[PDB]
Design a protein around this ligand. Structure first.
Ligand SMILES: [Mg+2]
Ligand SMILES: [Zn+2]
Lengths: 197, 145, 100, 41, 295, 148, 79, 78, 50, 223
């Protein structure tokens, strides 16, 4: 198929699970006719060849055009083998610098993907019905239960649970114990200030 | 790696064109859901074998005439809590195999969606979903052993 | 160098012919980034022969994997050498030891 | 060969037959589209 | 050129309109978000002048935990309610207030005896609930000026002293881009106060303290040209002028069928317009987003 | 003996030292294991992995996009990915990957022209690799035809 | 933008009819001359259509009624 | 072996003809104009042969010239 | 109010989903991930030979 | 009082070596030692200006993947040795140095032609070795001022580009310890130990860091 690419996946811990990280040099190729249309819509290019040259030489306004055209436009991320239907999911792109796709951690269990050399393929929905199917059916925030048994598939996995385990524990004679606090905000203010454990 | 792929391909090809095409076939036959007991241990309780299905008969209480739930109910979490409060016995439910609809299944024999909490919608392709659900964990099963 | 090894680095580095091992013992009389000239000892020369060994190093050649092959000298001008010790390193080699 | 010697005919009713031809599968958002065809047929 | 750095330009402080604010500044140099945010947070948490309750003395209670008749709350509950009492003293650095009260209604902050220097920011703050009619509560509460948090264990009934006017501050650094540069910083500071000062004033005071600590070292051109540029004949130019088309951008957007309906304009005259427009690489069916560029 | 070496040069015997955070400047609550490890750079570079395509050259007999990175080819949308789109219920997303984006010769140009025109709508048409199948089946002496 | 479409699904009732209704409305707004019934905030046509559906302003019956009214008015105006 | 589709000059010219806001008749005229272009880029027939190939009685040579002047500023220019 | 392992976190999300809905569950999952990452890094956990 | 903070001053500067120093700031209040130490450390490690070699032009070479007759090092190794050259220019933002050498021996940084503004701080920096009796090397080195790390890729057939690391400082370590000032006992003292390459004064480095911090902080005072 056309309008498709692939590359190695890395981790982005700053994301929300409805968005992914897409390189800005891959999105320039995947979204090229959209960029032509947006360029010649606002008078920057009066011909198709002028827009073609502007995209070819990568001027400083085609990046603003790209940020405008990728605003709300899901992309389908797929990792082979596709054993079940959760191996293809739709995310909202965020333009990053580099050559590796950034994947949300919580969606790694569904893909059965780890960051030691795996690769993913990205596809672009074109028509106005595909963009709504990728948003109301295939979106990453819609499938949080497993269709096989009905249990959650977005569980925190390894060092998201280690931090929550370490934080929620008790010690016999820790620093600043036995005092009476007035709320969680005072507890955090004591912890950050170093007055309590 | 390859045997599981062959098995899931065959499972998909045998049941590709099964689709929920109705809402009620008008029959209330079905299976009887009893807990699995190998002889010494109860492997699976009855709260997991009926969670999200449709009853095929009057299942109220063994004692007398006290209708706890009607003839057609979707046994969700609250109903299952009520079931475990009163120690409810075996229940008869409607299954896909005992369906009167031709060229498809109905939304009441099937039951819950298992991805959304509601009842299954008309159109959704359940054969492919079931084949992928069965065939996906095939890589966790021993082959040579 | 690994800085934590098993002692098998030298055998792998020498047996695989990526280095430049002296054929006869002598004294290095010319050192350059692309050639080494060794003045062989008097007791290792054939009769009626000018005793010198000339080693031409491989510089920035392409391998089967589109990588770089490059040999650099590890000896100095006027220093003794013996038979069997390295004169130039290779790709992934540090003073005759494997270094990946 | 056995479909040729028998002169069989295919009505394109399943999901794998509308993929070979390139139509809307009668499962998801294409269910109403096939309902219209069956209604007007 | 080597000693100049980026400065914030988009500061868009947003109010939760009472005591909670969320200030966003961008773009910072790479790594300056953590520096500024951590410095401001540490200064606001650890060292900020303020006035707070230090200790109390209830007439009927001589122990930290005991039984007081007619009060619904326990003694440590009363200490907790007094800890959150926000005070704004003006003249002195140590003052004493009294809370003699009797009845069946709740005893709140508005029942404290008035003083000229002392000011209370929340009279609705409830200190205790008196239940028995014959019951009475009379205690002396002393407030002092200081900085930061002083637990009672570090040092009558002792109360932890929270002099700092801050209740919570959290910063977050996100990615921001200038048109050319790829990696910049975007600082978001979300903070709350106990009502004595606004969040923006606390940020300004922390910045002032830190900055005073360092005094010893510190379209396309063709579309814009007038339609008179074209070598139009008399009749075509007159028709275009009668159609109020004063620029090429206006003529280009007019579709062919619309120009056909124009009175006094014919097919052979429309073909000449199309010819003279095509000799410049232009057509009659182009779309423009928002044509008139305020000119 | 590692612990004798860690005492010859004055280092902690445990092998763990205390570390500080570079951003906040505050000590990590527990000692961490620091040391020197021998790292390799494997021959899997992300420069040779990244690929993208919008429109390029197609095959001759079956006019579908070519395969590979040196040929500016497209990603294969195989059978197991068609099953995943059939399980979701995405009929239009599946139909546009079978005709418009891959094989329907007269629909590719219409879709491109519509995308450049700001109108996101497709005329599906018929794939060009089923006509090849019909022509190859009926060259075996078997009369297969579309009717009505 | 938006992250979930649960309200629109609840109002329409089915997850497969919501896609079709939203596509119809978004095509009306995009290639037609219609304008949004809600204040657009740098949003695209699909998200605007979903936000209109969420507030009970758009469904199949409303679209059909408005189309019939438009056809009747156009046929009356053409005379 | 299957092959690969290469892009000639006329394919490139058609890729721009389809993306130019012509009309139904203008695109039909442009098809004939692009068809009669050899590998060196020069029109090989007179415009009276294109006006005849259109097969319409109401089209005049002025429209053919207007379309030709637009096709002549494609890529490559000239 | 307990030591949260891996089973005491999945049941928390399941309870949030069954009581509240879909949007609060998504926001809760994101916040859980952020807090877990932050405090796992802050703990300075490691592994040695002792 | 409680609203009056004692402010620090640069008390002592100790030059342990040519590329090592320890500065002292006191008196400091409680919590300000760590407030200032980490901020100054980050600013010093990230935002210091320096001078770096940017371009080289050896007389008889075409590219950096070649060798020279009589020189034991490759051109790539010569460039990697020229990266570490520590140079302090004092009048301009760009200078060109010249190196001519002939005869057997090392070619150190003391062989660069003397210039009034340029100062070489480590004249023992070995660049290459000449191993031939009739061998000469002649090169023109371009040095310019900046800050940070600029690779050649982001920014004739005989001009060779090298990546420019303009930061002088190598490592910073701060220590907060109790100070004996007047009668108060809560005051602290911050000791900053820094290792540069020898091309920047510790006091001016501290003052530049403080000026950068203050000019970045002035955007909050108004708000
Ligand atoms: Mg892996
Ligand atoms: Zn049924």
């Amino acid at each position: 198929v056309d309008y498709s690419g692939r590359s190695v996946i890395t981790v982005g811990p700053y994301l929300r699970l409805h968005q992914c990280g897409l390189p800005k040099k891959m999105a320039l190729e995947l979204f090229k006719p959209f960029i032509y249309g947006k360029l010649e819509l606002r008078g920057l290019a009066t011909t198709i060849k002028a827009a073609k040259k502007m995209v070819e030489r990568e001027e400083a306004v085609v990046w603003d055009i790209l940020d405008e055209v990728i605003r709300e436009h899901p992309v389908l991320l797929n990792r082979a083998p596709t054993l079940h239907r959760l191996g293809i999911q739709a995310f909202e792109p965020v333009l990053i610098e580099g050559k590796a796709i950034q994947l949300h951690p919580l969606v790694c269990a569904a893909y059965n993907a780890d960051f030691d050399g795996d690769q993913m393929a990205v596809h672009v929905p074109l028509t106005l019905e595909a963009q709504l199917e990728a948003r109301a059916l295939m979106m990453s925030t819609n499938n949080i239960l497993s269709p096989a048994n009905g249990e959650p598939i977005i569980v925190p996995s390894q060092d998201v649970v280690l931090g929550l385990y370490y934080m929620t524990r008790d010690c016999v004679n820790a620093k600043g114990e036995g005092m009476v606090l007035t709320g969680p905000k005072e507890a955090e203010r004591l912890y950050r200030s170093g007055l309590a454990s | 790696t390859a045997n599981s792929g062959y098995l899931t391909r065959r499972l998909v090809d045998v049941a590709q064109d099964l689709v929920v095409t109705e809402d009620d076939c008008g029959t209330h036959e079905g299976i009887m859901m009893t807990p699995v007991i190998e002889g010494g241990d109860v492997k699976e309780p009855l709260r997991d074998r009926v969670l999200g299905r449709v009853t095929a008969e009057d299942v109220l209480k063994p004692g007398t005439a006290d209708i706890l739930v009607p003839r057609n109910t979707l046994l969700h979490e609250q109903w299952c809590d009520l079931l475990e409060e009163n120690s409810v016995d075996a229940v008869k439910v409607r299954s896909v195999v005992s369906c009167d609809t031709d060229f498809g299944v109905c939304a009441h024999c099937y039951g819950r969606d298992l991805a959304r909490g509601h009842i299954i919608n008309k159109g959704e392709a359940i054969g492919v979903i079931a084949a992928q659900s069965i065939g996906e964990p095939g890589t966790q099963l021993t082959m040579r052993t | 160098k690994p800085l934590v090894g098993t002692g098998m680095e030298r055998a792998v580095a020498v047996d695989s012919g990526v280095t430049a091992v002296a054929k006869r013992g002598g004294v290095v009389q010319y050192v350059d980034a692309s050639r080494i000239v060794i003045k062989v000892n008097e007791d290792e020369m054939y009769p009626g022969e000018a005793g010198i060994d000339i080693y031409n190093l491989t510089k920035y050649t392409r391998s089967n994997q589109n990588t770089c092959i490059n040999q650099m000298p590890c000896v100095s001008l006027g220093e003794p050498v013996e038979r069997g010790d390295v004169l130039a390193d290779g790709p992934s080699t540090d003073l005759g030891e494997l270094a990946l | 060969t056995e479909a040729a010697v028998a002169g069989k005919r295919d009505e394109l009713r399943g999901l794998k037959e509308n993929v070979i031809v390139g139509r809307l599968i009668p499962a998801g958002t294409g269910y109403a589209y096939h309902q219209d065809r069956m209604r007007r047929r | 050129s080597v000693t100049e750095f980026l400065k914030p330009r988009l500061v868009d402080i947003e109010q939760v309109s009472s005591t909670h604010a969320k200030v966003t500044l961008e773009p910072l140099e790479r790594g300056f978000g953590h520096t500024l945010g951590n410095a401001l947070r540490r200064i606001l948490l650890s060292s900020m002048p303020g006035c707070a309750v230090t200790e109390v003395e209830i007439d009927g209670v001589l122990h930290e935990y005991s039984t007081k008749e007619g009060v619904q709350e326990d003694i440590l509950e009363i200490l907790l309610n007094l800890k959150g009492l926000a005070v704004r003293v003006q003249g002195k650095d140590e003052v004493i207030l009294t809370l003699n009260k009797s009845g069946i209604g709740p005893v709140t902050a508005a029942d404290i005896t008035h003083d000229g220097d002392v000011e209370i920011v929340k009279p609705q703050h409830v200190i205790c609930h008196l239940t028995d009619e014959n019951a009475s509560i009379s205690m002396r509460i002393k407030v002092q000026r200081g900085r930061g948090y002083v637990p009672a264990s570090t040092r009558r009934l002792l109360v932890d002293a929270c002099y700092s006017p801050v209740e919570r501050i959290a910063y977050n650094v996100e990615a921001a881009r200038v048109e050319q540069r790829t990696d910049l910083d975007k600082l978001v500071i979300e903070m709350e106060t106990n009502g004595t000062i606004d969040p923006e004033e606390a940020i300004r005071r922390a910045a002032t303290i830190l900055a005073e600590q360092l005094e010893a070292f510190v379209f396309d051109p063709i579309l814009l040209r007038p339609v008179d540029d074209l070598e139009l004949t008399v009749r075509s130019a007159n028709c275009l002028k009668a159609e109020a088309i004063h620029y090429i951008g206006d003529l280009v957007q007019r579709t062919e069928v619309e120009l056909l309906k124009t009175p006094n304009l014919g097919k052979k005259s429309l073909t000449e317009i199309k010819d003279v427009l095509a000799s410049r690489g232009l057509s009659l069916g182009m779309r423009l987003e928002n044509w008139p560029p305020a000119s | 003996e590692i612990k004798e070496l860690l005492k010859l040069g004055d280092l902690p015997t445990s092998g763990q030292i205390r570390l500080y955070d570079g951003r906040t400047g505050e000590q990590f609550e527990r000692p961490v294991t620091v040391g020197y490890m021998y790292m390799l750079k494997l021959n899997h570079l992300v420069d040779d992995k990244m690929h993208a395509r919008s429109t390029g050259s197609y095959s001759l007999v079956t006019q579908q996009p070519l395969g590979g990175k040196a040929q500016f080819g497209g990603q294969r949308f195989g059978e197991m990915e068609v099953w995943a789109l059939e399980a979701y219920g995405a009929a239009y997303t599946l139909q546009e990957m079978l005709t418009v984006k891959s094989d329907d010769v007269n629909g590719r140009t219409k879709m491109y022209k519509n995308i450049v025109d700001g109108n996101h709508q497709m005329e599906p048409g018929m794939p060009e690799s089923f006509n090849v199948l019909l022509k190859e089946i009926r060259s075996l002496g078997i009369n297969i035809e579309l009717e009505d | 933008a938006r992250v979930t479409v649960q309200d629109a699904v609840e109002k329409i009732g089915n997850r497969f009819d919501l896609v079709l209704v939203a596509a119809r409305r978004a095509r009306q707004m995009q290639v037609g001359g219609k304008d949004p019934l809600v204040p657009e905030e740098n949003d695209k046509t699909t998200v605007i259509a979903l936000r209109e559906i969420e507030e009970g302003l758009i469904n199949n019956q409303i679209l059909d009624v408005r189309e019939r009214q438009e056809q009747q008015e156009q046929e009356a105006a053409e005379l | 072996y299957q092959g690969e589709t290469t892009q000639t000059l006329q394919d490139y010219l058609m890729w721009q003809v389809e993306l130019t806001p012509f009309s139904d008749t203008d695109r039909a005229i442009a098809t004939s104009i692009v068809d009669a272009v050899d590998e060196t880029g020069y029109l090989t027939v007179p415009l009276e042969d294109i006006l005849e190939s259109i097969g319409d009685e109401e089209i005049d040579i002025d429209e053919v010239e207007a379309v030709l002047k637009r096709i002549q500023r494609f890529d490559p220019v000239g | 109010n307990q030591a949260l392992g891996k089973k005491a976190i999945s049941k928390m999300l399941n309870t949030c989903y069954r009581i509240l809905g879909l949007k609060p569950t998504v926001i809760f999952a994101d916040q859980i991930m952020y807090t877990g990452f932050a405090y796992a890094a802050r703990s300075g956990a490691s592994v040695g030979i002792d």
